[PDB]
Amino acid sequence: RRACISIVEWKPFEIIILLTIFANCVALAIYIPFPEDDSNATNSNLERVEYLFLIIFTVEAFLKVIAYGLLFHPNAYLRNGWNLLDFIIVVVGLFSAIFDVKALRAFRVLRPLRLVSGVPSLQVVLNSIIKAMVPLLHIALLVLFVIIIYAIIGLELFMGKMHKTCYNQEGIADVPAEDDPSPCALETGHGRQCQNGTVCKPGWDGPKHGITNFDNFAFAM
Amino acid sequence: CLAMQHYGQSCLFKIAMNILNMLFTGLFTVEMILKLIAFKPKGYFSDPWNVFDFLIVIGSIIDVILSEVNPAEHTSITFFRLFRVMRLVKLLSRGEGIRTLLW
Amino acid sequence: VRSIASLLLLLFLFIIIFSLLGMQLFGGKFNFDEMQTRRSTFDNFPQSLLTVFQILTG
Amino acid sequence: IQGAASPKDMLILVDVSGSVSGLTLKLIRTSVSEMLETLSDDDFVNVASFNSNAQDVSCFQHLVQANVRNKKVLKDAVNNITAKGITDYKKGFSFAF
Ligand SMILES: CCCCCCCCCCCCCCCC
Ligand SMILES: CCCCCCCCCCCCCCCC
Ligand SMILES: CCCCCCCCCCCCCCCC
Ligand SMILES: CCCCCCCCCCCCCCCC
Ligand SMILES: *[C@@H]1O[C@H](CO)[C@@H](O)[C@H](O)[C@H]1NC(C)=O
């Protein structure tokens, strides 16, 4: 009985399966991610199209696991396919049941990565590209160590010294006086000083949104 | 230990880091003394790496000695602090491929 | 050419993937009370591609 | 305004759906305020809003004469609004009419 399913692979349906992967790739550019739960008509039919893609992919997984066995299938590039099927099943089930349920929808963007695998004419060029990656690992560790050293030095020197900016001296409203907050340091500390009518006092005017300063170690890195 | 410190630090945390700083500089001074006993200064200065270690440990102790006074209170020169981190470069020497490439 | 098209096809596929991922992460989340100068946004796929391309060139 | 037009019975269908969150919501609120600024005391007004359900941003549920006072309530309600949900013009317009 398993042969009847297996001989189907002799019939080239892999062409239709790759056209299905391409169809799903197309069915993700149309999906507009509206800001906060909004959704036009198209986004309300792409769930149905996604259900169809789920069914076809899981049928293919069943066929190619039954015809090729449970143990042997993972021992191949198909590792991702079953992974995608598992996460997509879980996503659909949880979404229907109802939290990180929605955000988990991103795991489908790997399906285009199935396209390159399906056309073995490209796996060669992928292998070529990653083959040249190994020599860089020495440069990778060198740059990693340079980053660590310079981040630690920055922590030692610029130890959160960019949190004081120039404030209005009238004092009615305490907002960063300069439209472009430029960290200033009050006298007794080398640096710039406010203009003739403002005062540089502590606070967190700081750099843009406080994302680029040297406060933590992660910020330094 | 070096990377741990961060802005808005706790006075207890600063004290603990000072303790660990003294401990680590002590261990590296033990490194130095054991190497010297292993072989004399003329052989100690044979490779620059140990000479490179020479200035780091002295600078670190200079840092610790300078730390005895309290210009700030747990309620100036800041150059020798970087030798501690620069000592990390020794770790880059263990790898041989990177060593030969950079050299 | 037949060898060029493979590499460019691979890179095009990579940009599509890292744009379709940005859509599911930052899709329409670039709405801030500040003035909307966020031209390089992730809203719609034709513009997610331009943002990813901008990041690639850096 | 007293001369350029006859009295009115406005009904502002502010579109608080997810598609307006951000700057556009601020523009909507400011525009609604600057519009209610252009209503006399003899022409009525109300402020509905639809996100698959046509609620009312205020406590009124019908037209309220746009006095100097009711305008205050409508402006405060508009200012204290937030986007959500799914846009549905049919329900909003049915409620409005
Ligand atoms: C490979 C060629 C076909 C690619 C497109 C397949 C999916 C198209 C279905 C969704 C299109 C929007 C219809 C929603 C109803 C207005
Ligand atoms: C109130 C004193 C705080 C602790 C300072 C003592 C130095 C050692 C740190 C505490 C023990 C944690 C493990 C240290 C590494 C072996
Ligand atoms: C505030 C006292 C004067 C400035 C002290 C720092 C002087 C040295 C800065 C550069 C040191 C790092 C060199 C690059 C890493 C090898
Ligand atoms: C005597 C053998 C030397 C082997 C090579 C060591 C290279 C050390 C310097 C690498 C370049 C500077 C990186 C860090 C700069 C702060
Ligand atoms: C805004 O309206 C909501 C309605 O749920 C209410 O709970 C809240 O107290 C209001 N806040 C302000 C700022 O008026």
Side-chain angles (χ1 to χ4, degrees), chain A residues 139 145 152 156 159 216-217, chain B residues 3 6-7 81 91-92 101:
Chain A
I139 302 319
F145 264 117
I152 289 168
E156 183 65 13
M159 180 51 232
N216 271 350
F217 176 80
Chain B
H6 52 271
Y7 167 73
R81 292 74 200 160
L91 183 63
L92 269 175
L101 190 63

Side-chain angles (χ1 to χ4, degrees), chain C:
Chain C
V1 173
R2 203 175 280 95
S3 174
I4 297 169
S6 159
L7 292 169
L8 282 71
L9 190 153
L10 172 142
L11 181 53
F12 167 75
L13 192 84
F14 182 76
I15 295 178
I16 296 169
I17 290 169
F18 266 43
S19 64
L20 293 163
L21 180 77
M23 259 175 52
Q24 307 308 308
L25 271 71
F26 314 149
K29 289 205 186 48
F30 276 20
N31 282 96
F32 301 139
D33 206 354
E34 274 203 358
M35 298 321 92
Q36 190 272 328
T37 61
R38 300 318 185 279
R39 292 299 297 260
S40 62
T41 180
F42 276 86
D43 291 323
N44 51 2
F45 186 76
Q47 192 158 4
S48 164
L49 282 190
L50 302 181
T51 295
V52 161
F53 210 99
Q54 160 175 345
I55 298 179
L56 284 200
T57 73

